[PDB]
Write an enzyme that holds these catalytic residues in place. Structure first.
Site, mmCIF file in Angstrom:
data_model
loop_
_atom_site.group_PDB
_atom_site.id
_atom_site.type_symbol
_atom_site.label_atom_id
_atom_site.label_comp_id
_atom_site.label_asym_id
_atom_site.label_seq_id
_atom_site.Cartn_x
_atom_site.Cartn_y
_atom_site.Cartn_z
ATOM 1 N N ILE A 1 41.024 35.552 44.680
ATOM 2 C CA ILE A 1 39.982 36.771 44.919
ATOM 3 C C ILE A 1 38.647 36.159 45.197
ATOM 4 O O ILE A 1 38.268 35.309 44.838
ATOM 5 C CB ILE A 1 40.288 37.739 43.583
ATOM 6 N N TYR B 1 40.499 28.405 32.874
ATOM 7 C CA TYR B 1 40.270 29.537 32.907
ATOM 8 C C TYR B 1 40.935 30.513 31.767
ATOM 9 O O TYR B 1 42.061 30.243 31.433
ATOM 10 C CB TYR B 1 40.038 30.487 34.146
ATOM 11 N N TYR C 1 41.056 43.039 43.280
ATOM 12 C CA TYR C 1 42.183 43.584 43.610
ATOM 13 C C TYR C 1 42.035 45.039 44.179
ATOM 14 O O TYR C 1 43.015 45.752 44.669
ATOM 15 C CB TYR C 1 43.329 43.887 42.549
ATOM 16 N N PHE D 1 45.822 40.387 29.187
ATOM 17 C CA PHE D 1 44.864 39.027 28.919
ATOM 18 C C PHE D 1 45.781 37.899 29.351
ATOM 19 O O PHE D 1 46.949 38.024 29.053
ATOM 20 C CB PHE D 1 44.576 38.889 27.416
ATOM 21 N N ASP D 2 45.386 36.889 30.062
ATOM 22 C CA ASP D 2 45.975 35.717 30.735
ATOM 23 C C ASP D 2 45.146 34.656 30.716
ATOM 24 O O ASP D 2 43.958 34.672 31.066
ATOM 25 C CB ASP D 2 46.873 36.187 31.911
ATOM 26 N N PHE E 1 36.427 37.103 33.305
ATOM 27 C CA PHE E 1 36.787 35.678 33.324
ATOM 28 C C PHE E 1 35.694 34.818 32.742
ATOM 29 O O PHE E 1 34.580 35.047 32.885
ATOM 30 C CB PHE E 1 37.071 35.101 34.751
HETATM 31 C C1 LIG Z 1 48.519 36.484 36.069
HETATM 32 C C2 LIG Z 1 47.320 37.177 36.445
HETATM 33 C C3 LIG Z 1 46.226 36.562 37.545
HETATM 34 C C4 LIG Z 1 44.918 36.403 37.349
HETATM 35 C C5 LIG Z 1 43.977 36.339 38.404
HETATM 36 O O1 LIG Z 1 43.259 37.669 38.725
HETATM 37 N N1 LIG Z 1 43.526 35.149 38.984
HETATM 38 C C6 LIG Z 1 44.086 34.057 38.432
HETATM 39 C C7 LIG Z 1 42.991 32.770 38.550
HETATM 40 C C8 LIG Z 1 42.205 32.917 39.792
HETATM 41 C C9 LIG Z 1 41.524 34.220 40.065
HETATM 42 C C10 LIG Z 1 42.829 35.539 40.421
HETATM 43 C C11 LIG Z 1 43.368 35.157 41.530
HETATM 44 O O2 LIG Z 1 42.513 34.801 42.450
HETATM 45 O O3 LIG Z 1 44.725 35.559 41.701
HETATM 46 C C12 LIG Z 1 45.296 35.255 42.642
HETATM 47 C C13 LIG Z 1 46.217 36.399 43.094
HETATM 48 C C14 LIG Z 1 46.459 36.427 44.849
HETATM 49 C C15 LIG Z 1 45.728 36.569 45.418
HETATM 50 C C16 LIG Z 1 45.000 35.596 46.262
HETATM 51 C C17 LIG Z 1 44.078 35.994 47.359
HETATM 52 C C18 LIG Z 1 43.434 37.017 47.308
HETATM 53 O O4 LIG Z 1 42.493 37.509 48.132
HETATM 54 C C19 LIG Z 1 41.917 36.608 49.275
HETATM 55 C C20 LIG Z 1 43.934 38.157 46.469
HETATM 56 O O5 LIG Z 1 43.270 39.506 46.760
HETATM 57 C C21 LIG Z 1 43.991 40.469 46.125
HETATM 58 C C22 LIG Z 1 44.854 37.737 45.829
HETATM 59 C C23 LIG Z 1 45.958 33.930 42.467
HETATM 60 C C24 LIG Z 1 46.851 33.867 41.567
HETATM 61 C C25 LIG Z 1 47.389 32.552 41.198
HETATM 62 C C26 LIG Z 1 47.226 31.556 41.743
HETATM 63 C C27 LIG Z 1 46.103 31.590 42.975
HETATM 64 O O6 LIG Z 1 45.834 30.464 43.741
HETATM 65 C C28 LIG Z 1 46.544 28.785 43.448
HETATM 66 C C29 LIG Z 1 47.784 28.988 43.714
HETATM 67 O O7 LIG Z 1 48.132 30.093 44.596
HETATM 68 O O8 LIG Z 1 48.677 28.086 43.183
HETATM 69 C C30 LIG Z 1 45.708 32.665 43.403
HETATM 70 C C31 LIG Z 1 44.246 37.223 36.237
HETATM 71 C C32 LIG Z 1 44.008 36.970 34.675
HETATM 72 C C33 LIG Z 1 43.972 38.044 33.898
HETATM 73 C C34 LIG Z 1 43.371 38.954 34.682
HETATM 74 CL CL1 LIG Z 1 42.853 40.552 34.040
HETATM 75 S S1 LIG Z 1 43.646 38.979 36.128
#
Ligand SMILES: C=CC[C@@H](C(=O)N1CCCC[C@H]1C(=O)O[C@H](CCc1ccc(OC)c(OC)c1)c1cccc(OCC(=O)O)c1)c1ccc(Cl)s1
Length: 128
Positions: free
Chosen positions: A75, A45, A101, A55-56, A118
């Site tokens: 999320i 992604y 968030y 941006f990431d 995304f």
């Molecule tokens: C470095 C930034 C984080 C990135 C982001 O928002 N995510 C990362 C990819 C997946 C979607 C989303 C995310 O769920 O973030 C989560 C943040 C933590 C989190 C998890 C569950 C949640 O709700 C149930 C939650 O609610 C606020 C936050 C995340 C980050 C990294 C790994 C991960 O799972 C695998 C592991 O833990 O190994 C999950 C974004 C990228 C660009 C953005 Cl604008 S936001």
């Protein structure tokens, strides 16, 4: 803009039909199977604010992003969105804060009440 197209033409895949998660299929995956709750999913992604002011991208680790679907590891928009995806599919998601968030945000990266965008590619998924 890829976001603009999702607004205009994206499908509301929320249960409440509140347009909190909108989706466009950018490249069709294979077959019919999409993952069940508890499946292990493998994606690439990249993501940004509706602005794009942040941006990431996963790719920087050429390894996939891995999680268990439907278990709250990501999320809410991802548990909803990735559930609808087929193997090999590439989709765009536009996401209102309430499915990401919220007003809490995740400072300093993610501000309060942020809309997220995304591009997700589903590489594979395997059973619990
Ligand atoms: C470095 C930034 C984080 C990135 C982001 O928002 N995510 C990362 C990819 C997946 C979607 C989303 C995310 O769920 O973030 C989560 C943040 C933590 C989190 C998890 C569950 C949640 O709700 C149930 C939650 O609610 C606020 C936050 C995340 C980050 C990294 C790994 C991960 O799972 C695998 C592991 O833990 O190994 C999950 C974004 C990228 C660009 C953005 Cl604008 S936001």
């Amino acid at each position: 803009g890829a976001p603009a197209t999702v607004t205009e033409q994206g499908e509301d895949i929320t249960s409440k039909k509140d347009r909190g998660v909108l989706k466009i299929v950018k490249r069709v995956g294979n077959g019919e199977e999409t993952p069940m709750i508890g499946d292990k999913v493998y994606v690439h992604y990249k993501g940004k604010l509706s602005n794009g002011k942040k941006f990431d991208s996963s790719h920087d680790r050429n390894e996939p992003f891995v999680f268990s679907l439907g278990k709250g590891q990501v999320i809410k928009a991802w548990d909803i969105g990735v559930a609808t995806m087929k193997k090999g599919e590439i989709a765009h998601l536009l996401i209102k804060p309430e499915y990401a968030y919220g007003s809490a945000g995740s400072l300093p990266k993610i501000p309060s009440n942020a809309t997220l965008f995304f591009e997700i590619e589903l590489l594979d998924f395997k059973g619990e």
